[PDB]
């Protein structure tokens, strides 16, 4: 538990130096579960990068910060935000990463209606990421609209890996209570050993976000919502009359209480609903800079 002991460990795995030596004009754009996010300008080029800053002292579980380094070093992908370099800056871990200038999906689902071509495009992109992550043993454990970032051209990428975990033949299940209340899988809230299926449940909840604008039981306090996820039947859309039977059938393979019966990322990529998926250009008009 020594802060300065943990600073020393982090120092051995991160890149040397201080990125303020080549970055200008830090501006805070977001706040996450483990820290804040800034936009910065690369002095030499004028390009923009993102900088996640995470205070070692504010972490509940300091050792999860290594997830940021583990993902950066070994699991890059088309639909995963790219991480360039990590630094120890005083008491903070800084990750210089790709700037997803179109913002988070949350700003879209809370201010406009997505049609199913856009929803299917989001789901397809997120499922391509998860099928590759799951195949290599990596569980995200914090899937929600806040964790889905967009390019200005509508490309969709997975972000915020600060809570992920690895499984393998020697460690086939995780047991940690991790995630965001309204999005957590039932077996996770039940403290059962779980695997990649919890990401599939969380994506189902995010589908409900895109249809309803908010996850189920969002008006209830977080602990009450978790008990209702644990004990009640799968949460239903508030607007079932507004989803095509194709979308409802997709969602039904997602929000299955028995994780053995839940569809996997690999299976879901074959579902007919994803044939509705539009190109990234179809997400562009949803973003704040382009809405009315």
């Amino acid at each position: 538990v020594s802060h300065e002991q943990f600073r020393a460990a982090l120092q051995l795995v991160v890149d040397p130096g201080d990125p303020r030596s080549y970055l200008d004009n830090f501006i805070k754009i977001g706040e996450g579960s483990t820290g804040i996010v800034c936009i910065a300008t690369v002095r030499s080029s004028g390009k923009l990068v993102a900088v996640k800053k995470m205070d070692l002292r504010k972490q509940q579980r300091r050792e999860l910060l290594f997830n940021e380094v583990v993902i950066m070093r070994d699991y890059q992908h088309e639909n995963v935000v790219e991480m360039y370099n990590s630094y120890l800056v005083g008491d903070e871990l800084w990750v210089v990463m790709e700037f997803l200038e179109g913002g988070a999906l949350t700003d879209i689902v809370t201010h406009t209606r997505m049609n199913e071509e856009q929803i299917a495009a989001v789901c397809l992109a997120v499922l391509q990421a998860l099928s590759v992550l799951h195949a290599q043993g990596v569980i995200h454990r914090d899937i929600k609209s806040d964790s889905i970032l967009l390019t200005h051209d509508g490309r969709v990428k997975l972000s915020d890996f600060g809570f992920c975990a690895q499984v393998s033949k020697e460690v086939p299940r995780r047991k940690s209570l991790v995630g965001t209340p309204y999005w957590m899988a039932p077996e996770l809230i039940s403290r059962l050993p779980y695997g990649p299926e919890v990401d599939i449940w969380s994506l189902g909840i995010m589908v409900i976000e895109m249809v309803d604008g908010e996850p189920p039981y969002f008006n209830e306090p977080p602990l009450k919502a978790m008990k209702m996820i644990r004990d009640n039947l799968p949460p239903r859309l508030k607007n079932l009359h507004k989803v095509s039977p194709s979308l409802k059938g997709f969602l039904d393979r997602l929000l299955v209480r028995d994780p053995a019966q839940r569809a996997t990322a690999a299976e879901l990529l074959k579902h007919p609903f994803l044939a509705k998926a539009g190109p990234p250009a179809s997400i562009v008009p949803l973003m704040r800079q382009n809405r009315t």
């Binding site: 996450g32 579960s33 483990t34 509940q60 929600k144 809570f163 209570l177 965001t180 209340p181 977080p222």
Partner: peptide, 5 residues
């Protein structure tokens, strides 16, 4: 609250 635990 959209805050992760």
């Amino acid at each position: 609250k959209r805050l992760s635990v």
